[PDB]
Structure 1
């Protein structure tokens, strides 16, 4: 359904990069045991098999190769040592390559790029496995980045990108993809990138070794080698994937509702209101007991002192809210959700300002019967990633299927609209669609 056309390995150009390391911080160590991240970029273009083979295949290989010489960790590996004392790091060694799979899919592309419920498992063989680990005497090596480029004959192309979270955050991914696409768009040339582009900063400017040591202990690095197993998504499943739109106009209406009912709520944004609304739908859909809802925060600009945008690696925080489900249901529920999110976010941002870096409580206070964590930052415009065929028709974060997660991104006919991706069982999707639509 699924035909593998080529299994390739792509390296930086000959004689450009030597052996290189990148040292990691607690921001990176926090992700040691995370599952891989899987992202899809769908493009519409009337491409034949012969054309795909003739120009697309060599173009992908060539442009990625060039990009890799500026982004060495993308072709490196995560190396974790059993010694409690030798810290994990990213190592690139000459000879290291990125696995790039070229494939062909016989599904109708129009059945995948829509926003209505589609089987979550139809997407798994569009995203590459992270890749097998290398086990040596002194250490384990884990691939950080893999790619699949899938032809939909006469219809278009899906680019599947799988990465390890230790490689970097959304911002790092964004920086890489800007460079790669620029290099691609401009005919496999890094001239325009070197002149006008944003280059990664590898300077190790986050220096908190006591935090480093504490985060590693938490992520149990001593048993990592023995514990670590691959975590690829595989069907079959009854779950359905859908995309929900919150337009600028609807967001502003919801926001006015919040500001009018809660005139002294200290934090209200498009994003908190969107979260509030979807949180409320999830509460009505589950009809459970107690819920947690949270999302990541890019901390670069809130660090003391601030961290340049171009900083390579993770610099992410998070904010969470917990409420009884009964309090989150209905028109009033959305208001309560917005209140709680806004208060917790205000507190979290206040903490960062004061320089606070850190942050089984639930066994005591109460176990949530639903936990939801947002994958995504609407601020980063992945919808503009153009390899030369134009902007993507559809983005999907496929790794939300693994756990309590939804995706939130900007749209991209409009950067002020929001797209929310959900993968849930078929029984719940029916009601969820009505809940989301009717509440608007």
Structure 2
């Protein structure tokens, strides 16, 4: 590692313009995600300015803007409170009398910045190295442990660029919500204290009185998770040495059409299939991902799990800007023989759409079968699995602290699993950037089959 830390500090919300306390409940949507304490989000920026300007001006204004935007995102300055004793339930808490506050790390790195941001093969470890390791438990009260929610590590590459590296506990925000926060923080820094986050649709909602647990999912989800939380809680927070490299792929909207029509042409008349930019991009990626395994050296089932934002399907109406987890587990299944065969792309896209219709588009309600979300996931062999985090809906390249849009946005937390992430493309309007992570021998296999599909 060539990352040297310059300063560690604490960012609090504004004093005397906040409540001394804010307690927040743990809805049944948040419970599946309680054991995941890393939802990393890296953002590289071109910054052709002297390290002096960085420290003199850039760090203050970020420290400054972060404080202001915290008065609208208060829970992010608090912690998660995990129960130590049976019969108590988790919660979120911000106590200003505890000096609750996000840890900012001011760092300086001496690596090649144009390398760390590129789309060509990038060592995944170099990327995890730019993130601060949040503690597992910052203090133990008498009912619950206190687990931190957010830390950011700003890191300068002198005369090259800046890398903003955030780390959120997955209990407090899903992909949509966490990107809203990053975009408010950027927005208030760029424009200033008199920045209208409401008008910009970057104003959260923490009211969960309208989140109602009508199917008793909260009780069921807690008890299934009990086993998981014990096992996964004893993982020291340091990033393991990943034997995985990162590569980045870009599809135009037109290259999605070349995939769309490829599916339509493959005589997908028989049953009409739903063909969207999302189901396309996964469909094609999953198909390549399955084939890559073979070229490295069966006829079992391959699974592809993804999340879906229920905020729009809930009842009562749940605000679009509701902050927190609000996701649905979807698991496509398909035959290895079929996904690698002549109709592989067509099989995959059909499979992914057939998973949303039974789950999300379940014409009986989203939560109708939700007592099963937690018990399908575990029935996936780790050997036959693909996952996708993020969504083209989220404005990942709109995070502009005042230096321009980002050079790259990397959901770095993918390496912890057989995952890919799909992000709004930076340079193409309705395109997508697909972040893939694989060992290099494997990764070469992927890209080959990825290139050949056109």
Class of the TM-score when normalised by the shorter of the 2 chains: over 0.9
In structure 1, C-alpha distance between the alignment counterparts of 2:309 and 2:377, rounded to whole Å: 29
Show the counterpart of 2:89: 87
**Equivalent of 1:401 in 407, 415, 437:** 415
Q: Secondary structure at the match of 1:123?
A: helix
Show the counterpart of 1:201: 205
In structure 2, C-alpha distance between the alignment counterparts of 1:19 and 1:387, rounded to whole Å: 29
Instruction: Give yes or no for the alignment of 1:312 onto 2:323.
Output: yes
Where does 1:29-48 land on structure 2 (aligned, <5 Å)? Answer: 29-48=31-50
In structure 1, C-alpha distance between the alignment counterparts of 2:176 and 2:376, rounded to whole Å: 31
Asked if structure 2 preserves the Cα contact closer than 8 Å seen for 1:265 and 1:342, the reply is no
Deviation string, structure 1 residues 168-198 (Cα, Å, up to 9, x no partner): 11221122122211210113x1443256544
Instruction: Give yes or no for the alignment of 1:161 onto 2:172.
Output: no
In structure 2, C-alpha distance between the alignment counterparts of 1:339 and 1:306, rounded to whole Å: 30
Asked if structure 2 preserves the Cα contact closer than 8 Å seen for 1:5 and 1:103, the reply is yes
Show the counterpart of 1:147: 152
Asked if structure 1 preserves the Cα contact closer than 8 Å seen for 2:12 and 2:70, the reply is yes
Show the counterpart of 1:253: 258
Where does 1:88-167 land on structure 2 (aligned, <5 Å)? Answer: 88-94=90-96, 95-133=99-137, 134-167=139-172
In structure 2, C-alpha distance between the alignment counterparts of 1:212 and 1:30, rounded to whole Å: 10
Asked if structure 1 preserves the Cα contact closer than 8 Å seen for 2:69 and 2:184, the reply is yes
Where does 1:53-68 land on structure 2 (aligned, <5 Å)? Answer: 53-68=55-70
Asked if structure 1 preserves the Cα contact closer than 8 Å seen for 2:135 and 2:237, the reply is no
In structure 2, C-alpha distance between the alignment counterparts of 1:6 and 1:86, rounded to whole Å: 38
Where does 1:66-81 land on structure 2 (aligned, <5 Å)? Answer: 66-81=68-83
Label 1:106 to 1:353 Cα distance change in 2 as closer, same or farther (>3 A). farther
**Alpha-carbon distance, 1:318 to partner:** 2.4
**Alpha-carbon distance, 1:48 to partner:** 1.1
Instruction: Give yes or no for the alignment of 1:271 onto 2:278.
Output: yes
Label 1:363 to 1:173 Cα distance change in 2 as closer, same or farther (>3 A). closer
Asked if structure 2 preserves the Cα contact closer than 8 Å seen for 1:45 and 1:156, the reply is yes
Unmatched tracts of structure 2, length 5 or more: none
Q: Secondary structure at the match of 1:337?
A: helix
Asked if structure 1 preserves the Cα contact closer than 8 Å seen for 2:187 and 2:195, the reply is no
Where does 1:178-197 land on structure 2 (aligned, <5 Å)? Answer: 178-187=183-192, 189-193=193-197, 196-197=200-201
**Alpha-carbon distance, 1:360 to partner:** 9.9
Asked if structure 1 preserves the Cα contact closer than 8 Å seen for 2:221 and 2:374, the reply is no
Show the counterpart of 1:15: 16
Q: Secondary structure at the match of 1:356?
A: helix
Deviation string, structure 1 residues 12-45 (Cα, Å, up to 9, x no partner): 1221222111112000111111241111011002
**Alpha-carbon distance, 1:361 to partner:** 7.2
Label 1:246 to 1:58 Cα distance change in 2 as closer, same or farther (>3 A). same
In structure 1, C-alpha distance between the alignment counterparts of 2:31 and 2:375, rounded to whole Å: 22
In structure 1, C-alpha distance between the alignment counterparts of 2:155 and 2:365, rounded to whole Å: 47
Label 1:412 to 1:367 Cα distance change in 2 as closer, same or farther (>3 A). closer
Instruction: Give yes or no for the alignment of 1:386 onto 2:400.
Output: yes
Instruction: Give yes or no for the alignment of 1:213 onto 2:219.
Output: yes
Show the counterpart of 2:433: 419
Q: Which has the larger displacement, 194-203 or 101-110? A: 194-203
In structure 2, C-alpha distance between the alignment counterparts of 1:208 and 1:380, rounded to whole Å: 27
In structure 1, C-alpha distance between the alignment counterparts of 2:306 and 2:80, rounded to whole Å: 25
**Alpha-carbon distance, 1:250 to partner:** 1.2
Where does 1:281-320 land on structure 2 (aligned, <5 Å)? Answer: 281-287=288-294, 289-320=300-331
Label 1:292 to 1:420 Cα distance change in 2 as closer, same or farther (>3 A). same
Instruction: Give yes or no for the alignment of 1:341 onto 2:352.
Output: yes
**Alpha-carbon distance, 1:127 to partner:** 1.4
Q: TM-score, normalization: structure 2?
A: 0.91
**Alpha-carbon distance, 1:417 to partner:** 0.9
**Equivalent of 1:49 in 35, 48, 51:** 51
Show the counterpart of 2:334: 323
Q: Secondary structure at the match of 1:213?
A: helix
Deviation string, structure 1 residues 335-394 (Cα, Å, up to 9, x no partner): 111111122222223326635341397899884632111011111111111000010010
Show the counterpart of 1:369: 383
Asked if structure 2 preserves the Cα contact closer than 8 Å seen for 1:100 and 1:148, the reply is yes
**Alpha-carbon distance, 1:276 to partner:** 0.6
Q: Secondary structure at the match of 2:415?
A: helix
